[PDB]
Design a protein around this nucleic acid. Structure first.
Ligand SMILES: [Mg+2]
Ligand SMILES: [Zn+2]
Ligand SMILES: [Zn+2]
Ligand SMILES: [Zn+2]
Lengths: 65, 263, 33, 56, 84, 56, 134, 46
RNA sequence: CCAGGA
């Protein structure tokens, strides 16, 4: 839930890259592997951060108060 | 020029590729260690929460705020609060950040590292600015709010090192390799048929001479020449990760010389 | 006609309110879809 | 069987065990909190008097 | 009934249990401010004091060794061989 | 369980940080312990006599 | 990492690897006794009974409830309650001795009987430590 | 100023005292919350 | 009792 700032393994900021990744997929139709790489996420530790994220926050927002 | 030598291969805001020749592996490593652990940085350390109507916990958010990179260029002219003479914090030892956010929009309202505002006097020094590398210029996404979702908090950023917390880590991964042809026999290659065919050739193989099979094993041979890549997070510029790393290790050694002196 | 006690209902059964509820209805009801 | 052959006892402590290549065969790593709870009744004697007064 | 010293037949050597109990007992007594029968060469731990007393056979204790019938042989710590 | 005299042995204390009882790896076998989530019991003697029993 | 133990990247742990939230809801109600002899949800003092918990009552408000935000830490009284006898006996609910955390949600509701009903949720973050299983 | 208790659903503040009636003003629902302390809580960002 | 841990 909610994109991790910084990759656990090396600590490369990954907090900014979320919307940008989600955009390179809808708007650019691009496959996951290219979008990640476009965003400069080269090490698999960094790749796994975005590639395997589950943004549960968006469901959480669906409840009123 | 003199002793150990550098030969930069590539540069950017975020990366330094170089070759370190005429050095002890022990030295190359000790520098590598320091860059990761002992270079000081500014990072949020106390978070006073006035209001939080969010789907996230006070401390969940608090944790993230520490991982947000802050401008630590002039970190050297800021004091560690521990060493400072006040009661808790002050200007001489901290940067005060403020964050007020509210879901005015019917649509989801986002909270970014850009939404942070400095409230403390900076003494005109390059410090505490949330690092924005983001194309759209937003920086780190801290939170998401809906309607009456308010987030009102205060951050106290302090000077620190990665040994205390990894948030004060100015460097991302540091690449480090030597002897791309295993001339030193420092590894026994695991294989099934051929270690040469099975194991991928390094980039750096091009920057060294292949061993040529019709030669005896060089036992006398020692490890010098290190192919490294230093990646910055933002707090300090790539070059200064290297320089400050060299300097920290130098200062660290000086302390020992000085300790002996007092003894 | 005559009240013969109270029967515990199973969640999502015909007699339960949630059976006919949409995703959006459940979120309003504070129930997880 | 339950109150006489076996008994619940004071000066007992229990926690998760973990290994250590740096402990000597015959020693046992005791968590500070556990050490701070468990006690030994030592008699005040010329030999220990000063030490004991300090721990007090 | 008590077996005469000239008719004693148990080991001339001190048992592990005997030695552990003598050391325990002396250490306990030493710790209860009993008089110490040896030069404490800086010693402060009553067990290390006990060990020292037993090392020089200056422990004034006797082992009453009971036999299954009820009789017994008394043995001095001074006279028991400490091969342990 | 304690189906052995070796399932209860006397160790030297070593006060350490962190919430686990640390043991030397070679002493694993007599206890029949591993570190997959095993817990262990500690009993403290209260007399000079009792201590001797353990140590000796 | 011998005999089923493992080594964790303390650096990664700081970055949020394996951190978890933990919540716990303490509950209580006001018991009515035939002739309208109810219990009371309040912050009690000495006042004859003296048979009250040894933990800080001071974290409680007039309704015998801690406000959601307050850091509870040991045996600090989380719920204040009293019952008289033919007077303030103490019916207070302290934080589970072992535990500590922050008051999350306090719920003040009605019972089927129309009686005072309370549920206190306390939140903490559990960061991966040594004997922690994976 | 001052909101002793809040409503669970409609989220309208209530501010009631002892023996006032455990219910909300407009909606029925006897649920009701507590509203955060005014004694601001500080956390280490680690 | 019920659920679980070695
Ligand atoms: Mg096991
Ligand atoms: Zn990474
Ligand atoms: Zn200061
Ligand atoms: Zn309402």
């Amino acid at each position: 839930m909610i994109v991790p700032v910084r990759c656990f393994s090396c600590g490369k900021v990954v907090g900014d890259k979320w919307e940008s990744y989600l955009n390179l997929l809808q708007e650019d139709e691009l496959d996951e592997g290219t979008a990640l790489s476009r965003l400069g996420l080269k090490r698999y530790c960094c790749r796994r951060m975005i590639l395997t994220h589950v943004d549960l926050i968006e469901k959480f927002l669906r409840y009123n108060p | 020029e003199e002793g150990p030598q550098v030969k930069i291969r590539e540069a950017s805001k975020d990366n330094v590729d170089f070759i370190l020749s005429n050095v002890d592996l022990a030295m190359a490593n000790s520098l590598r260690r320091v860059m990761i652990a002992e270079i000081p940085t500014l990072a949020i350390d106390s978070v006073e929460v006035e209001t939080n109507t969010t789907v996230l916990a006070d401390e969940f958010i608090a944790h993230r705020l520490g991982l947000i990179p802050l401008q630590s260029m002039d970190i050297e002219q800021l004091e560690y609060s521990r060493d400072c003479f006040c009661e808790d914090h002050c200007d001489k030892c901290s940067v005060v950040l403020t964050l007020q956010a509210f879901g005015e929009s019917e649509s989801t309202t986002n909270v970014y590292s850009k939404d942070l505002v400095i409230v403390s006097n900076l003494m005109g020094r390059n410090i505490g600015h949330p690092i924005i590398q983001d194309k759209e210029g937003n920086g780190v996404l801290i939170c998401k709010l809906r309607k009456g979702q308010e987030l009102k908090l205060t951050c106290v950023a302090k000077k620190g090192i990665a040994k205390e917390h990894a948030k004060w880590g100015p460097a991302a991964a540091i690449e480090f390799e030597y002897d791309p042809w295993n001339k030193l026999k420092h590894t026994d290659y695991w294989y099934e048929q051929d270690s040469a065919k099975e194991w991928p050739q390094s980039k750096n193989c091009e920057y060294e001479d292949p061993p040529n099979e019709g030669d005896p094993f060089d036992y006398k041979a020692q490890a010098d020449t290190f192919y490294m890549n230093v990646e910055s997070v933002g707090s300090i510029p790539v070059d200064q990760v290297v320089v400050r790393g060299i300097d920290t290790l130098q200062k660290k050694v000086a302390s020992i010389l000085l300790a002996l002196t007092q003894m | 006609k005559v009240f013969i006690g109270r029967l515990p209902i199973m969640l999502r059964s015909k007699n339960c309110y949630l059976s006919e509820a949409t995703e959006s209805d459940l979120y309003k009801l504070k129930e997880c879809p | 069987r339950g109150n006489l052959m076996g008994k619940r006892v004071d000066f007992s402590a229990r926690t998760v065990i973990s290994g250590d290549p740096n402990l000597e065969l015959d020693q046992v790593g005791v968590p500070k909190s556990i050490a701070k709870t468990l006690t030994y009744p030592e008699v005040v004697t010329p030999y220990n008097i000063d030490r004991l007064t300090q721990l007090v | 009934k008590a077996i005469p010293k000239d008719q004693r037949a148990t080991t001339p050597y001190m048992t592990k249990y005997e030695r552990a109990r003598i050391l325990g007992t002396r250490a306990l007594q030493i710790s209860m401010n009993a008089p110490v029968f040896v030069d404490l060469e800086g010693e402060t731990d009553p067990l290390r004091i006990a060990m020292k007393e037993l090392a020089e056979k200056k422990i004034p204790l006797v082992i009453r060794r009971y036999l299954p019938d009820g009789s017994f042989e008394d043995w001095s710590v001074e006279e028991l061989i400490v091969d342990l | 369980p304690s189906l052995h005299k070796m399932s209860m042995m006397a160790h030297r204390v070593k006060v350490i940080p962190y919430s686990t009882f640390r043991l030397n790896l070679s002493v694993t076998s007599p206890y029949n312990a591993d570190f997959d989530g095993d817990e262990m019991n500690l009993h403290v003697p209260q007399s000079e006599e009792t201590r001797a029993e353990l140590s000796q | 990492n011998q005999e089923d133990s493992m080594i964790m990247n303390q650096s990664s742990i700081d970055r949020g690897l394996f951190r978890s939230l933990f919540f716990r809801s303490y509950m209580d109600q006001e018991k009515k006794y035939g002739m309208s002899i109810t219990e009371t949800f309040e912050k009690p003092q000495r006042t004859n009974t003296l048979r009250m918990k040894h933990g800080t009552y001071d974290k409680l408000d007039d309704d015998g409830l801690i406000a959601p935000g307050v850091r509870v830490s040991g045996e600090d009284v989380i719920i204040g309650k009293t019952t008289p006898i033919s007077s303030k006996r103490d019916a207070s609910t302290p934080l589970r001795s072992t535990e500590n955390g922050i008051v999350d949600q306090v719920l003040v509701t009605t019972n089927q009987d129309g009686l005072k009903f309370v549920k206190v949720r306390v939140r903490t973050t559990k960061i991966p430590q040594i004997g922690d299983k994976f | 100023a001052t909101l002793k208790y809040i409503c669970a659903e409609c989220s309208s503040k209530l501010s009631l005292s002892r023996t006032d009636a455990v219910r909300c003003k407009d909606c029925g629902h006897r649920i009701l919350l507590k509203a955060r302390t005014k004694r601001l809580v500080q956390f280490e960002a680690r």
